[PDB]
Design a protein around this ligand. Structure first.
Ligand SMILES: CN(C(=O)c1cc2ccccc2cc1C(=O)[C@@H](c1cccc2ccccc12)P(=O)(O)O)C1CCN(C(=O)c2ccc3ccccc3c2)CC1
Ligand SMILES: *[C@@H]1O[C@H](CO)[C@@H](O[C@@H]2O[C@H](CO)[C@@H](O)[C@H](O)[C@H]2NC(C)=O)[C@H](O)[C@H]1NC(C)=O
Ligand SMILES: *[C@@H]1O[C@H](CO)[C@@H](O)[C@H](O)[C@H]1NC(C)=O
Ligand SMILES: [Co+2]
Length: 226
């Protein structure tokens, strides 16, 4: 998160920290959020050989009794996820066991395909991503308020599609989601509407978020079958 503030510890109980092991190189991390006791929603580009989810955290390098760490047993990348168009950057993760719901660990619902969030309103995103182009990922969970922009604001992003993605962050400000925040949810009025997908390597807003509403049917299918 660029230009955000540290969250009040445990104020966003649905936040999930993902530690991903790549079939080949260094490990990496992403954000995500609990939509069911045993399911976490995140970005498809965050997939890997194996993933461990940590719930109930704030300072990810400091274990707390609120922590619930669970191994992912199944990765469900959207079938149409495309690395060229970067469309459908969404994925569901099934946890080895159901997490226990506590004040520090809770679920968040996903929106209906009929509910299309239009440009103009203010939302917020949280994450453990880098706080600058040359800064490491934040130890603590950060959050920032960002403006939902007209899709035209994201025309410089190849294949940007208003029906599938959200254009987030006023370009005349430096505040923005950034590397490491991927997979993390964008909340507008307390309801999840997007998933951090990608943006400029130089961290300049706006960034691209997956429009969650568009994938409700797909999400419900997976939940039904698992
Ligand atoms: C240098 N960058 C950034 O510093 C960056 C800027 C951002 C700005 C705003 C919001 C989110 C952002 C996320 C990132 C990343 O690098 C992500 C990340 C890491 C690795 C592969 C990823 C694949 C798809 C989406 C995010 C990915 P990360 O957050 O997972 O680590 C980004 C610039 C634009 N990108 C690409 O053209 C791109 C597309 C397909 C790819 C497929 C395989 C490998 C690399 C790839 C890179 C992505 C990296
Ligand atoms: C996040 O947690 C870690 C681990 O507790 C903090 O790192 C330590 O920071 C303290 C500051 O009181 C230092 O005295 C130690 O030397 C550090 N040790 C380690 C393990 O690196 C880190 O500062 C915390 N970050 C915050 C609160 O922003
Ligand atoms: C990604 O979509 C592009 C553009 O529509 C298409 O050419 C390609 O087949 C897709 N990616 C793959 C190889 O699945
Ligand atoms: Co605490």
């Amino acid at each position: 998160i660029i230009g955000g503030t540290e969250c009040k510890p445990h104020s966003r109980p649905y936040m999930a920290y993902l530690e991903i092991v790549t079939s080949n190189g260094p490990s990496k991390f992403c954000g995500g959020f609990l939509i069911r006791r045993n399911f976490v929603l995140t970005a498809a580009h965050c997939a890997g050989r194996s993933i461990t989810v940590t719930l109930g955290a704030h300072n990810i390098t400091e274990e707390e009794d609120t922590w619930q760490k669970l191994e992912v047993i199944k990765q469900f990348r959207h079938p149409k996820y495309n690395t060229s168009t970067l469309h459908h950057d969404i994925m569901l993760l099934k946890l080895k066991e159901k997490a226990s719901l506590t004040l520090a660990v809770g679920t968040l619902p996903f929106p209906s395909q009929k509910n299309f969030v239009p440009p103009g309103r203010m939302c917020r995103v949280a994450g453990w991503g880098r706080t600058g182009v040359l800064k490491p990922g934040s130890d603590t969970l950060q959050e920032v308020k960002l403006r939902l922009m007209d899709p035209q604001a994201c025309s410089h992003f190849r294949d940007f599609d208003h029906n599938l993605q959200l254009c987030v962050g006023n370009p005349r400000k430096t505040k923005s989601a950034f590397k490491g925040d991927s997979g993390g949810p964008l909340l507008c009025a307390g309801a999840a509407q997007g998933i951090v997908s990608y943006g400029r390597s130089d961290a300049k807003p706006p960034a691209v978020f997956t429009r969650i509403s568009h994938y409700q049917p797909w999400i419900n299918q997976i939940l039904q079958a698992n």
